[PDB]
Structure 1
């Protein structure tokens, strides 16, 4: 009954998913966990704070890979992860989400015949210019187990020819995380006090996607829209490090001063900011869902989302950044809104469902 299960994680949102899962595997008797941190997120506010606050053991391995092209990053990680797998020889490799790390892990494993399970499988944007879209498609096609969080994702995998018996709708482990760490956030966050905000008295924003930050006019559209909204309702913005580097390089730095621009916060503070906001504006996948978790209206600053159920339930609304004036107006309009009551993403036990499937599979 001694099974070794190795998780590959590279970034903040993967650390959070792995926490939810690791919490449950830690209670599985006879399961040894190994964690490989690939190196993409290394700053202590992007990485270690997740390990501390979320109670995750330090990574068994730090590969320290990041900062180059898709080829460099992905190719160096593929070779580096495979080296770990030949030594650790796990029974299962878990990969999470849709980064270059995810694919590099799936691909390292599948060629060694090591069973791979994709946590958060079958999400599609249908925009292959997104690197994440390639990553999750190829990942999914290389996996033995596909842990789908929604029915859309199930349907996506069936339509690409993947057999039912490898597909499991288990819900979203990020809902487990919100459920299980909520009380701890409540008890230990002092972020509202420290910023001097009260409930329903601000708007929360995050923005980090390449399409939005790698293009000067697009980024300007966003920051100027945020500064405008700030006039009517205060705007709290924990700026991703790369979003700060890009704003700076572009001369848009002045705009961050016109809002409540913070550094990245940890999960417990993030939970309290999200729970207590009037509205959340984001280009993050995870924040989209978490907005819904706390029944706070969301605007997503993208041309599409993989989380289509949120749009359909009216909790989310897309606003591509074409014009600052219009984007501000949309944000203020949507602050007045609410979606319909509905249960998405499961019961908070997606991680237990995952654990059960891993041990009782037949390897």
Structure 2
């Protein structure tokens, strides 16, 4: 009708962010939306339940690309995305996060003189070996509008010579989504019932990174710690399939009967879990932020984390799997902590502010 805003997405978090943006857009008449998924129409990365439960729109296009090298995936995505852009001639192109899809969308649009906005801009790990570091840098420098989630992000962009007037501090739209899904789980998740658990009466653990799941001592130290912690507090562990088959491969599948081990759980139930736990123990970077979003203290069993500002506001604590005694104690300590009451990633209406800056 009056403005076309086309979203490119090719990973689950990008769909989640695009849907949070789209909740705001869909309430203004005369925004027409187009959703372009770079991947396979019925990719098994995702499920009926991911779409229904997390309220993800049906893409208008599926480009069918993935499973290649960075060159094959990115090259094909650049051609195919360009084609859709030429066909749809949208006013705005929104790209999200820092995958190959992000970069394809931006490079496709900028050569066509179609304005590109990068949702989640300015994040730097300062290690160009990560494909995602290259993706975010190049997306940032190709985009017209840079929607940063933090002040560090903003400063990262300025230090790189991007003009201030292309940079907008809007917060992290994954916080908005955490709140939306948070409310929804309270309304619908029953996983507390079926497990027979009490809000603020359990510890939740996820472990699925290499640095911990491969090495055998580490996975001892980790599961030996969770074992001992189960004694004081019910520990709930939804085990990445891959982390299960690594433990059954040092026979360690005995340190998993003391804890309520579970087979990976529905997305809403997992939110329920996260937001009602007294502590979350993990090596996932995503769960570290979800912890902060729901104001549940976090221990990070990793020897390194990426979200240093959660550490600095004492919502997250670094505890490297050395031995079980040392680790179970620091788990127990942190379980009775909290962090500073500061908003780190916006106020939960990043979507609003993005939308306002566009429909301008």
TM-score by length of 2: 0.85
CA change 1:332–1:104 in 2 (3 A) is farther
Contact 1:92 1:117 in 2 (8 A): yes
Distance 2:47 2:237 in 1: 19
CA change 1:333–1:177 in 2 (3 A) is same
Structure 1 residue 135: deviation in Å?
Answer: 2.2
Report the secondary structure of 2:176's partner residue. Answer: helix
CA change 1:57–1:246 in 2 (3 A) is farther
CA change 1:189–1:89 in 2 (3 A) is same
Structure 1 residue 226: deviation in Å?
Answer: 4.2
Structure 1 residue 47: deviation in Å?
Answer: 4.5
Structure 1 residue 199: deviation in Å?
Answer: 1.6
Structure 1 residue 293: deviation in Å?
Answer: 2.5
Partner of 2:109: 109
Partner of 1:82: 82
CA RMSD between the two structures: 3.2
Q: Which moved more, 1:165-174 or 1:212-221?
A: 212-221
Report the secondary structure of 2:305's partner residue. Answer: coil
TM-score by length of 1: 0.85
Distance 1:290 1:15 in 2: 17
Cα deviation code 1:114-145 (max 9, x no counterpart): 22211111122233343322222222222211
Structure 1 residue 167: deviation in Å?
Answer: 0.6
Structure 1 residue 170: deviation in Å?
Answer: 0.8
State the aligned residue count.
360
Structure 1 unpaired stretches of 5+: none
Cα deviation code 1:145-199 (max 9, x no counterpart): 1111111111111111111111101112122123333332111111111222212
CA change 1:251–1:48 in 2 (3 A) is farther
Structure 1 residue 52: deviation in Å?
Answer: 1.1
Distance 1:249 1:113 in 2: 54
Contact 1:174 1:286 in 2 (8 A): no
Contact 1:299 1:318 in 2 (8 A): yes
Partner of 2:295: 295
Distance 1:322 1:346 in 2: 35
Cα deviation code 1:235-281 (max 9, x no counterpart): 33334466567767887777666644444444422221111111112
Structure 1 residue 36: deviation in Å?
Answer: 2.1
Distance 2:203 2:263 in 1: 16
Structure 1 residue 313: deviation in Å?
Answer: 1.0
Contact 1:6 1:93 in 2 (8 A): yes
Contact 1:78 1:104 in 2 (8 A): yes
Contact 1:226 1:328 in 2 (8 A): yes
Cα deviation code 1:24-55 (max 9, x no counterpart): 01112211111122338966684443321232
Cα deviation code 1:58-107 (max 9, x no counterpart): 11223343444444433443333333323223222212222232223223
CA change 1:29–1:339 in 2 (3 A) is same
Structure 2 unpaired stretches of 5+: none
CA change 1:193–1:63 in 2 (3 A) is farther
Q: Which moved more, 1:245-254 or 1:290-299?
A: 245-254
* Structure (1 or 2) with the larger CA radius of gyration: 2
Contact 2:120 2:149 in 1 (8 A): yes
CA change 1:245–1:7 in 2 (3 A) is farther
CA change 1:170–1:233 in 2 (3 A) is same
CA change 1:88–1:252 in 2 (3 A) is farther
Distance 1:18 1:290 in 2: 18
Report the secondary structure of 1:34's partner residue. Answer: strand
CA change 1:179–1:77 in 2 (3 A) is same
Structure 1 residue 10: deviation in Å?
Answer: 2.5
Report the secondary structure of 1:261's partner residue. Answer: strand
Distance 2:228 2:353 in 1: 45
Structure 1 residue 336: deviation in Å?
Answer: 2.4
Contact 2:92 2:116 in 1 (8 A): yes
